[PDB]
Amino acid sequence: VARPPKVQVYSRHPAENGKPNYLNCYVSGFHPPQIEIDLLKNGEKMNAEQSDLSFSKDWSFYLLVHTEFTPNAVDQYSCRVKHVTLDKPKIVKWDRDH
Amino acid sequence: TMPPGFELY
Amino acid sequence: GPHSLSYFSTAVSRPDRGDSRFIAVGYVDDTQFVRFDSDAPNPRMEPRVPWIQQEGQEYWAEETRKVKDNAQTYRVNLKALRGYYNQSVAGSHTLQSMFGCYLGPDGLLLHGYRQDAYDGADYIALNEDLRSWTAADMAAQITKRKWEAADAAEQMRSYLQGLCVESLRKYLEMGKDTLQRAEPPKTHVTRHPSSDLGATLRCWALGFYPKEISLTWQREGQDQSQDMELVETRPSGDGTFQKWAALVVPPGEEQSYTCHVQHEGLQEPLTLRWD
Known about the structure:
The complex is a heterotrimer. By secondary structure, chain A is mostly beta strands.
């Protein structure tokens, strides 16, 4: 029943250029639990925390990778996810709208 | 609080 | 309510490291309050919110003792399951266990549960009568048979009826100022132009608790769900949650659409439009 991860990259608060915020990458619905989740800043991996492995009532695992960040007009943020179900890394770019 | 003991399969 | 106390545990075999990893997390309703990671330096049960930290040393020593016993036991179960199924020695496999209790109207157990899964598939689960098991396959019946002779269900049932609810009542009090107040969502309607016949409205609900919420779009009073995009509810990172619902509105029809937000933190359902 191996299944692909869903991915959302978003901020804790509505983002404004130059103001401290929090960058989240919420990865859920996947199985097996082995997975690689990286927050990227201009294509480069950031220092970020990862929540403890957990799952929902349908057995699907979920994880939160998060770090503080101050968005601006230039820096590109994205989240890169590697899973056995995925032929190649899944990459979702962040924006203040979604 | 977790349960007291956990069973073998 | 009903409020709930629940635990989620994941055991993963690591034949390439000679051992396995056991992770357990505890929740009161949608709030994780403890965790255990067998990979951690000095593996112990650790607090995950302020209110649980008022538990004395024996609490933490005992929870750690029990969860380590759970870890060692499930390491063995993984080895058994590999035999039971005749799987490869090099493969990594996953054992998930989930269990919890809900608080009834008169402070007694509501719907306790206990269910385990192997590699994502149902293995064995405690039945609704709390006295019998459902085994999903041949291997699970072997386990089921042992547990029947040993009345393992009585242990689980007495835990769910006694300690589980009792602890739940205790936790709800310790974190009352946090667990028993619903935090209403901060809501917004934003607009984002697309193409000629493309103009997206997005209704946001931010920083809310509990997790349960209802976001819908209407057009002059007509449900647009079949047209809208609704993302999975997601954690804010501070113990609250977020969600949004968006749809494409025709060029010039913004004001015919309304977003409706329903959450227990709210006195009444909120009607939002593109102000």
